[PDB]
Design a protein around this ligand. Structure first.
Ligand SMILES: CC(=O)O[C@H]1C(=O)[C@@]2(C)[C@H]([C@H](OC(=O)c3ccccc3)[C@]3(O)C[C@H](OC(=O)[C@H](O)[C@@H](NC(=O)c4ccccc4)c4ccccc4)C(C)=C1C3(C)C)[C@]1(OC(C)=O)CO[C@@H]1C[C@@H]2O
Ligand SMILES: Nc1nc2c(ncn2[C@@H]2O[C@H](COP(=O)(O)OP(=O)(O)OP(=O)(O)O)[C@@H](O)[C@H]2O)c(=O)[nH]1
Ligand SMILES: Nc1nc2c(ncn2[C@@H]2O[C@H](COP(=O)(O)OP(=O)(O)O)[C@@H](O)[C@H]2O)c(=O)[nH]1
Ligand SMILES: Nc1ncnc2c1ncn2[C@@H]1O[C@H](COP(=O)(O)OP(=O)(O)O)[C@@H](O)[C@H]1O
Ligand SMILES: [Mg+2]
Lengths: 428, 312, 426
């Protein structure tokens, strides 16, 4: 069988998981109490009396959001030992989430992960949701990833992270945490997907015609992306592609594994009509520079490999026609050493509409995952922010006050510079 | 001005059989490169350098300035089994392998033996350590929570610290031994606390009726420890946190002094507060960092080199 | 689960704390008798932060009141909310401080600090996981300044890894009631700059000006000032007891707001603030709150933010609101006023949003600022201290309790060094 394990660490990860599990329960027809009135074994497991239990682990060092989960509308779904909670939060400190407070619940979460893995026959990989910038999402994720790499090793690990925006920001010590966690994520992960809140805000403003978006809409969009990725494992259709095929068609070199995602068509109910929304139109809209979920225009770079994941009513002839039209264009530039850089996947299961949502019931949707050389601009901006704040050594005494030396910052900066250099040199 | 000196030690017999290899590469006499990354300093010593060269090139001018009524300060930072004790104390009587402190007392005493008869000298010695940000007295175990104040000339000092006179190098060595016999040492001989040693020399001309006071400071900096790679619990974790914070504060103070900033954060930690008189202005200070070139100790060597480079 | 121990020292501290406890009890829905008469589960969900359980559904505050005179104690005990405190938590002497820092800190406070520390220790051992300590006092008085400083030193010795935040009322230039205020203020700052994690500076002149201009009050009294201070105190720590989209702890605020260890002096704020008969003509949205918060006539410290630049600004929103609006407002505030913010720190503003507004409001926001304009306050205090110290005026009272001039000299040097630190980044 084909199963995956989901880990949500930090507040952002927990809320993304709330949205994702609501979406999964809606898709597979499972009520919040776990009773449904074989396409579900991927994310759930039976108990012998009709109850279905998710394969998820919720971890946070602060008891606030998890307590909201335990008393919410999905209180009867999760196993009470999966929701794990500490005493005091990381307070936006990498060291506190790494060691000082980390070595109090790490054994518990490792035991829970072992218990979930011992009950699954054909494990496919892990799905980690966290946010860069926070103490927990940058420090506790590193420790857990290191332990999993030591223990399991050969199993794939996919990450879905929130990257700091160019201008919009929330904390003041975000660059430090982001630099440390992106130093950690190059050694242990396998395919890291990054998004930022500003691009999704702009997408909601222009496409969805909503002027005051909140976190719920962003979480719903990310959940739709993840569901589109996992639909191939869950359902059936022509040209199905699983995780290992994704990685062997998307990652040319070992360290070039940082794609950026895009979804289409994100349309409202008022614009659901009055529009054709054929295969060609949806495919073309995905290459626009204003629909990317990362603040970086693809025009200032070259693509390497892109995988198209159609779902709904799609015929391969239309896909080939759209691919030819995309290839004949000039503003979209591929590298010379990749004569064929398209991976096509189709599924028969149309997207599902959540009640009280901003999306419309469409007959077909696409999800393109491509890794271009235009992803280094965000890293350059964040590194410039980091060095500007680190020249004066501000907010440093908080980090060294938890047993963390001063060499880690320089080492992580060197690693990020090396990664940017690798991307630039492979682009040419 | 601030001077940084780096010393390297040879591969001993107890570790040569394991097949370790050198990592350090030398260019000229002021650059040492590890993994194709330069680290420029004021002077880099090699394995063959004896103790006499180190003393003549690192501490002689500071000793000379003290005897004329100025102030000096010598630090010492390194990891365990990196050469710290060999370059600081060593064998206490060998005329070739003795450390820096025996040569310091020898030079400071050979001048008192040769300066006329109309000058009167006194020697004062103090020995206090910093542990968990609380000053203790190594020469009097009764005192445990001493404090720091300022006199009229806003020149800081330590209140209540034991101060005894000496008359010969034997007395200085004996009080050094007695003080060291009470310092905090973990389970091979790793120090868990910073140590400060003061040698006060004051002179009064009987004829000219002019008074000159001079202070020499010897500081043994404890080693920074990366907690994530060890597994510290309880008291060890607190000691590591305090050591790291104090070293970071000292580095910040030295960097601010070197860069010529208008404001120098002298009041961020106890150690920089005490040495406020003998750090800036017309004061000469030198820092000696001891490193190990074996591949088994690359990470700690890099950390020590980075701490040295932070000063600049 | 992240409990807070509350200590009130002196008359001003006691009255501010009484108003604060009335406000908190109203927010959580607790009758003066100590019972629960609320209407929501979120009120009782996190009640252990400020209250202790008792037999038969009763809640007692974790508050300790200390004074050297029995007047404020039985003035508080006769108030509307005097039946709520534990009678064993009252600790007092008989001989007053007499507006003498030396007396309260050396002679009569040393004969009472043991009992206060005993009750503090007893209160702090019933907590599952401590978070920090709260102190309310006034720097210009005798018992408040000295007693609070001594308690702070003792607690920082006993508990060295806990948050310590104090809400200290600062002497004002054009409003004064004591002739020896600068001495007390300097001797208190000399210790607050060392033994505190984050202190909030408040003065009566700014509160009077707010009441006169913004609220259009005719005859303000001390009740309104205490009420404003209590409102900002309650708004500081709203994320420790209510859910929200973004949660910020006290240690989170300390990490984000304090670049270097000494610079931990803040000027609080609040919004919205309007007058009766003028609320129907104003729309309440995020832009209005943002505009009001960053106004020079809304801070509770008698300093002009225009004569300086901010280092870090923390804005805690309460209510239902969009995150994009908050982010865009906090970005365009810095973009429009780039000359009022430090250039080498990107994103000077931190946003925390909670979804439980205060009763009777749709939206509320608290403002915490760390600006270099706070230097002029210490400048005035040091100038007055120098004026009164050359002639040794009113000095034999302090030296008559066991002090020395060296304490005054060291305190002045420390305050001057703090002023030099704040000016450097301008
Ligand atoms: C019809 C209506 O909306 O009336 C408002 C009101 O008119 C105004 C003017 C209120 C009013 O406040 C004052 O006039 C005031 C008096 C003394 C000190 C400070 C303020 C109000 O009294 C105060 C009251 O505040 C609350 O209810 C909050 O929960 C507040 N509560 C208390 O301070 C409190 C008072 C008495 C007993 C127990 C609690 C609070 C604020 C922060 C944290 C916790 C609680 C409100 C909204 C109003 C009135 C009633 C007129 C204002 O104050 C507050 C704190 O909201 C003054 O400027 C604001 C803007 C409000 O719109
Ligand atoms: N999409 C989304 N992003 C969020 C959400 N909450 C916070 N973020 C982002 O996450 C970053 C802040 O990190 P958090 O996840 O809140 O912090 P944390 O991981 O809980 O760590 P601590 O609270 O410090 O222990 C900022 O960039 C926020 O914009 C959310 O609910 N949804
Ligand atoms: N807000 C407020 N301030 C007060 C109150 N009582 C005194 N003050 C101020 O506190 C300072 C005097 O100190 P005080 O507390 O009375 O002296 P103490 O009793 O010895 O601590 C002056 O600046 C007063 O304006 C009060 O009830 N409320
Ligand atoms: N520069 C050097 N040249 C030769 N031998 C050295 C040198 N530095 C140290 N050693 C050798 O190292 C041994 C122990 O080093 P030590 O000073 O005890 O380090 P630590 O005190 O940190 O344990 C000594 O026996 C000494 O012979
Ligand atoms: Mg959190």
């Amino acid at each position: 069988m084909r199963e995956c394990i989901s880990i949500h660490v930090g507040q952002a990860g927990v809320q993304i998981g709330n949205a994702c599990w609501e979406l999964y329960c809606l898709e597979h027809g499972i009520q919040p109490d776990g009773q449904m009135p074989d396409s579900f074994n991927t994310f759930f497991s039976e108990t012998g009396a009709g109850k279905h239990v998710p394969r998820a682990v919720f971890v946070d060092l602060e008891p606030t959001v998890i307590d909201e989960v335990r008393t919410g509308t999905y209180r009867q779904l999760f196993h009470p030992e999966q929701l794990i909670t500490g005493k005091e939060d990381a307070a936006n400190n990498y060291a506190r989430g790494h060691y000082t407070i980390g070595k109090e619940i790490i054994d518990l979460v490792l035991d829970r992960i072992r218990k979930l893995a011992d009950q699954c026959t054909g494990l496919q990989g892990f799905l980690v949701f966290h946010s860069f910038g926070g103490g927990t999402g940058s420090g506790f994720t590193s420790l857990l990833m290191e332990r999993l790499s030591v223990d399991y090793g050969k199993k794939s690990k996919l990450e879905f992270s929130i990257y700091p925006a160019p201008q919009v920001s929330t904390a003041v010590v975000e660059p430090y945490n982001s630099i440390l966690t992106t130093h950690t994520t190059l050694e242990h992960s396998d395919c890291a997907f990054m998004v930022d809140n500003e691009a999704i805000y702009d997408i909601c403003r222009r496409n969805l015609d909503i002027e005051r978006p909140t976190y719920t809409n962003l979480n719903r969009l990310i959940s739709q992306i993840v569901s589109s990725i996992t639909a191939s494992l869950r359902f059936d259709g022509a040209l199905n592609v699983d995780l290992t095929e994704f990685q062997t068609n998307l990652v040319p070199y070992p360290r070039i594994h940082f794609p950026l995602a895009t979804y289409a068509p994100v349309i409202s109910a008022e614009k659901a009509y009055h529009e054709q929304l054929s295969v060609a139109e949806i495919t073309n809209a995905c290459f626009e520079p204003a629909n990317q979920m990362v603040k970086c225009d693809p025009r200032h770079g070259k693509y390497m490999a892109c995988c198209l994941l159609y779902r709904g009513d799609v015929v391969p002839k239309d896909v080939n026609a759209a691919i030819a039209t995309i290839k004949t264009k000039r503003s979209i530039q591929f590298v010379d050493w990749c004569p064929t850089g398209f991976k096509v996947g189709i599924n028969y299961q149309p997207p599902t509409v959540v009640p009280g949502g901003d999306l419309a019931k469409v007959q077909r949707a696409v999800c393109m995952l491509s890794n271009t050389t235009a992803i280094a601009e965000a890293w350059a901006r964040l590194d410039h922010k980091f060095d500007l704040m680190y020249a004066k050594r501000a907010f440093v005494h908080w980090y060294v006050g938890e047993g963390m030396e001063e060499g880690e910052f320089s080492e992580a900066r060197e690693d990020m510079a090396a990664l940017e250099k690798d991307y630039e040199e492979v682009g040419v | 001005n601030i001077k940084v000196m780096c010393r390297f030690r040879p591969l001993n017999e107890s570790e040569v059989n394991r097949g370790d290899k050198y990592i350090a590469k030398f260019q000229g006499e002021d650059t040492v490169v590890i993994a194709s990354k330069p680290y420029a300093f004021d002077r880099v010593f090699q394995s063959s350098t004896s103790q006499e060269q180190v003393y003549n090139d690192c501490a002689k001018k500071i000793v000379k300035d003290v005897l004329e009524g100025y102030n000096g300060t010598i630090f010492a930072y390194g990891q365990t089994s990196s050469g710290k004790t060999h370059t600081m104390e060593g064998k206490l009587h060998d005329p070739e392998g003795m450390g820096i402190i025996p040569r310091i007392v020898q030079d400071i005493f050979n001048y008192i033996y040769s300066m006329d008869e109309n000058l009167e000298f006194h020697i004062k010695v103090s020995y206090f350590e910093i542990y968990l940000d609380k000053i203790r007295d190594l020469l009097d175990v009764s005192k445990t929570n001493l404090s720091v104040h300022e006199d009229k000339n806003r020149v800081p000092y330590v209140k209540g610290c034991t101060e005894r006179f000496v008359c010969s190098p034997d007395e200085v060595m004996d009080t050094i031994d007695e003080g060291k016999s009470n310092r905090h040492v973990a389970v091979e001989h790793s120090s868990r606390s910073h140590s400060i040693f003061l040698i006060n020399v004051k002179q009064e001309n009987t004829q000219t009726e002019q008074k000159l006071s001079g202070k020499l400071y010897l500081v043994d900096l404890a080693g920074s420890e990366k907690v994530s790679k060890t597994g510290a619990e309880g008291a060890v974790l607190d000691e590591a946190k305090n050591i790291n914070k104090s070293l970071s504060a000292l580095g910040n103070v030295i960097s601010a002094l070197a860069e010529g900033s208008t404001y120098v954060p002298y009041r961020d930690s106890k150690m920089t507060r005490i040495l406020q008189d003998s750090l800036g202005g017309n004061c000469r200070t030198t820092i000696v960092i001891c490193c190990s070139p074996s591949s088994y100790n690359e990470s700690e060597t890099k950390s020590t080199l980075l701490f040295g480079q932070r000063a600049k | 689960m992240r409990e807070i121990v509350h200590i009130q020292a002196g008359q001003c501290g006691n009255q501010i704390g009484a108003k604060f406890w009335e406000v908190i009890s109203d927010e959580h829905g607790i009758d003066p008798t100590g019972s629960y008469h609320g209407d929501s589960d979120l009120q009782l969900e996190r009640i252990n932060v400020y209250y202790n359980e008792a037999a038969g559904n009763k809640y007692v505050p974790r508050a300790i009141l200390v004074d050297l005179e029995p007047g404020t104690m039985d003035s508080v005990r006769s108030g509307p909310f005097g039946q709520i405190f534990r009678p064993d938590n009252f600790v007092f002497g008989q001989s007053g401080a007499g507006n003498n820092w030396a007396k309260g800190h050396y002679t009569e406070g040393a004969e009472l600090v043991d009992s206060v520390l005993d009750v503090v220790r007893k209160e702090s051992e019933s907590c599952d996981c401590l978070q920090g300590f709260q102190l309310t006092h006034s720097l210009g008085g005798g018992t408040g300044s000295g007693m609070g400083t001594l308690l702070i030193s003792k607690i920082r010795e006993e508990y060295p890894d806990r948050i310590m935040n104090t809400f200290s009322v600062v002497p004002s230039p054009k409003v004064s009631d004591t002739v020896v205020e600068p001495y007390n203020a300097t001797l208190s700052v000399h210790q607050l700059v060392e033994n505190t994690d984050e202190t909030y500076c408040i003065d009566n002149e700014a509160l009077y000006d707010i009441c006169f201009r913004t609220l259009k009050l005719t005859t303000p009294t001390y009740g309104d000032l205490n009420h404003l201070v209590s409102a900002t105190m309650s708004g500081v720590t709203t994320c420790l007891r209510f859910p929200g989209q973004l949660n910020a702890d006290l240690r989170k605020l300390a990490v984000n707001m304090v670049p270097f260890p000494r610079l931990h002096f803040f000027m609080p704020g609040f919004a919205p603030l309007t007058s009766r008969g003028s609320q129907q003509y104003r729309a309440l949205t995020v832009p209005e709150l943002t505009q009001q918060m960053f106004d020079a006539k809304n801070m509770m410290a008698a300093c002009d933010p225009r004569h300086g630049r901010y280092l870090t600004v923390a804005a805690v929103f309460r209510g239902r609101m969009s995150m994009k609006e908050v982010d865009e407002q906090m970005l365009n505030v810095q973009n429009k006023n780039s000359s009022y913010f430090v250039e080498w720190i990107p994103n000077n503003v931190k946003t925390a949003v909670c979804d439980i507004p205060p009763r009777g409001l749709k939206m509320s926001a608290t403002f915490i600022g760390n600006s270099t304009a706070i230097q002029e306050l210490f400048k005035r205090i040091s100038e007055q201290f120098t004026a009164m110290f050359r002639r040794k005026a009113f000095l034999h009272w302090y030296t008559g309790e066991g002090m020395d001039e060296m304490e005054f000299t060291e305190a002045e040097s420390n305050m001057n060094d703090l002023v030099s630190e704040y000016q450097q980044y301008q």
